[model samples]
Target: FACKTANGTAIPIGGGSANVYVNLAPVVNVGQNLVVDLSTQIFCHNDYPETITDYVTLQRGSAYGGVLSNFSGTVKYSGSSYPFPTTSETPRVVYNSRTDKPWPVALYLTPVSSAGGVAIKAGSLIAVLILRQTNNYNSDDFQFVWNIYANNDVVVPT
Candidate 1:
């Protein structure tokens, strides 16, 4: 899976399949609560009635350059339904590489609780990475890098 900006720009990372690298080329305005998009087209429907869940992992590097720090984040989905551990994230951070430990989050939705009796449909997105600038600087002076993981599993009922 990959990520995009709020204005329909692709945020590319990891050079390619053969030679991988982290490239945060795209830049954004600083000192604001920015919401992003993950093109995780996760609509769940099947021929038979069964329980389903959609899970996604998202990570973002520190805001590089200019005056930005004290980075923090919050998460919400494209769909309207309640899930566990709401409001704040638990910070499931992962080592992106040798030194880069990006802030991470794990988001999951169940067919029953997530759907709220509605059908699960296409396009799952996490408009997260709430950020701001501590000092005076131009909006274009900072850049952000992101990493993502996505999967689906057959969960046994509790």
Candidate 2:
């Protein structure tokens, strides 16, 4: 089963609400495979903002981790163009759906790297999602909402 949350901030996935947390089930036992793709669309109404600010990662268990493939392009908003000066947008991520494993258990996305290293497992929830901006220095206080796309609970093809 796949659980998802969209919009707002500081939302939990499996159980916790910190931004990073350990999973309830470290490994899934089955005879199939699992894949999940997460992406977000952020609007920066100010000056040049940080692109690729959001990212998601998955781990085999509590000891190993891997970055998922598959994503959408990030674009900026110009006065009359959604992509600012350019009339094009680049794809920023890729989703890999080909695997021979069975049943996925953990996944997460965030704007900042996990401080404690997140452990993905069944019923693992998101701990924190922070929005930051660069001014004289990097600041963590800002107003940026996201439109997240989470597609989970997929079985590997045999």
Candidate 3:
């Protein structure tokens, strides 16, 4: 069984032996944040049973010098309020459990600034999430590309 939202929107969290993919909406504002609720998106059933140990890792692509500080964004996993960045090579594990239920993971982008006289420019960042079930021979992945705008003018892509 697949989870659905309040508005009847089916949660895109499922896959076979191959990699499952999902793209989240981009974050527009410079200081805006995006939160994804896993509780309603996770389902315990045939393809994704509850008897297997599941692991979810969050990865951020290195487009601009591979420096976390350059992005000026804070990423928090699980219940940790402390924000950090996860490189593509060393992604952070956000969810790991055998119990079937919902989990919380949040991503926040702060205003960019420069220590010197240089000006901070707008750019894009990619966030990748990989989910796998131990001994199940099945896995899923989600990729989210966020366009960090210069100001509060939010433009959602269609």
Candidate 4:
């Protein structure tokens, strides 16, 4: 559906539904902090929109081998906002990583968000991120996948 999204990807949610659209932006250097802008889009395709409960993320560069490889430990989950400056679920991010990708791969956004405005009628476009790198951050060409849950959600495809 998008340049970032590989077609046919789908995530089945438990109570709510969403698609995690990964957007890897540029990295900014601040002191020893490798500020990696690993942003994302969490689209809600239903009217019963859920609250920003929690989320997860993973990235794999060519040098890392396949997509199955987890490079989460190399970076830190900094912050976020989409459902209105929302950034309360931190531990949940770590929990999702421990579970690994695939369970998070089926991420698919019906559309984009944040750049525009409250296009709630067009599903719900929630985009926000602030990931910091522990290592070099650019050692490899990377592709990201997000495992998110506005409520209890699904295991997306890679």
Best by lDDT: 3
User: Candidate 3, residue 54: CA error in Å?
Assistant: 2.2
- Write the number of the candidate with greater lDDT, choosing between 2 and 3: 3
Task: Please give the range of 10 consecutive residues that has the lowest summed lDDT in model 4.
Answer: 61-70
TM-score of each: 0.23, 0.21, 0.38, 0.21
lDDT (10s digit) by residue, model 4, range 1-158: 00122332443332222244333212211122212232233222221214222233332211111111211112233332222122232332322122122222122122121212221121223332322111122232222233321221111222
Quantify all predictions' global Cα lDDT against the true fold: 0.25, 0.23, 0.35, 0.24
Off by over 4 Å in 4: 1-8, 15-36, 41-63, 66-73, 78-90, 93-158
Q: In candidate 1, what are the lDDT values of residues 24-143, reduced to their tens digit?
A: 112222233323223232111111113222122222322211112212333443333222224432232112222222223223322232221112111212122321111122222222
**Candidate 3 ranges beyond 4 A from true positions:** 1-50, 59-71, 81-85, 88-100, 114-152, 155-158
For residue 141, give model 1's deviation from the true position in Å. 12
**Model 3 RMSD in angstroms:** 8.6
In model 3, which residue pairs have backbone atoms overlapping below 3 Å? Answer: 39-102
**Clash count list over all predictions:** 1, 21, 1, 4
Return the candidate ranking by lDDT, descending. Answer: 3, 1, 4, 2
Instruction: Tally clashes: model 3.
Output: 1
- For model 2 the local lDDT of residue 98 reads 23
Error of 4 at 75 (Å): 2.2
RMSD of each: 19.2, 16.0, 8.6, 17.9
Per-residue accuracy of model 3 over 8-31 as CA lDDT, tens digit each: 334344533222222333333344
Kindly provide the TM-score of model 3 when superposed on the true structure, using C-alpha atoms.
0.38
| lDDT for model 4 | 0.24
